[PDB]
Amino acid sequence: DPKRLYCKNGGFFLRIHPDGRVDGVREKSDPHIKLQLQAEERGVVSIKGVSANRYLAMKEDGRLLASKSVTDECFFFERLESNNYNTYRSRKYTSWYVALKRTGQYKLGSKTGPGQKAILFLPMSA
């Protein structure tokens, strides 16, 4: 059920803190990296931090944060790319992807694009 999203860019797991902050951590024992990927329309998902009880959202300026409620900014197209990694592209801000920098900080949506390592994730069991 619950998965962890491993990013190819540095090997950080996407983390959703109880206060709404989003970043990455390499420690598999962190309680805030267990996520629930719920399907909405075919190929679209919402991403919830199980412990934080919040949903990942991408803002109009590219920021990543986690909301207590589900809005139109909380849905992402999940695609299995040719290299067998997944990407998560905002349904609202259609050219932007969820991504992490090699420092463990998230990468602004407006700076992402296909071919970047930052956008590649491997969902794993928790």
Q: How far apart are CA 63 and CA 59, in angstroms?
A: 5
Residues pairing with 66 in the sheet: 56
Which residues fall in the annotated binding site for heparin?
9
Report the CATH number at residue 51.
Answer: 2.80.10.50
Q: This structure's resolution (angstroms)?
A: 1.6
Which residues fall in the annotated binding site?
9
As for how many domains the chain has, the answer is 1
> 41-44: long-range contacts at Cβ-Cβ below 8 A with a sequence spacing of 24 or more?
43/77, 43/78, 43/79, 44/75, 44/76, 44/77, 44/78, 44/91
What is the domain extent for residue 5?
1-126
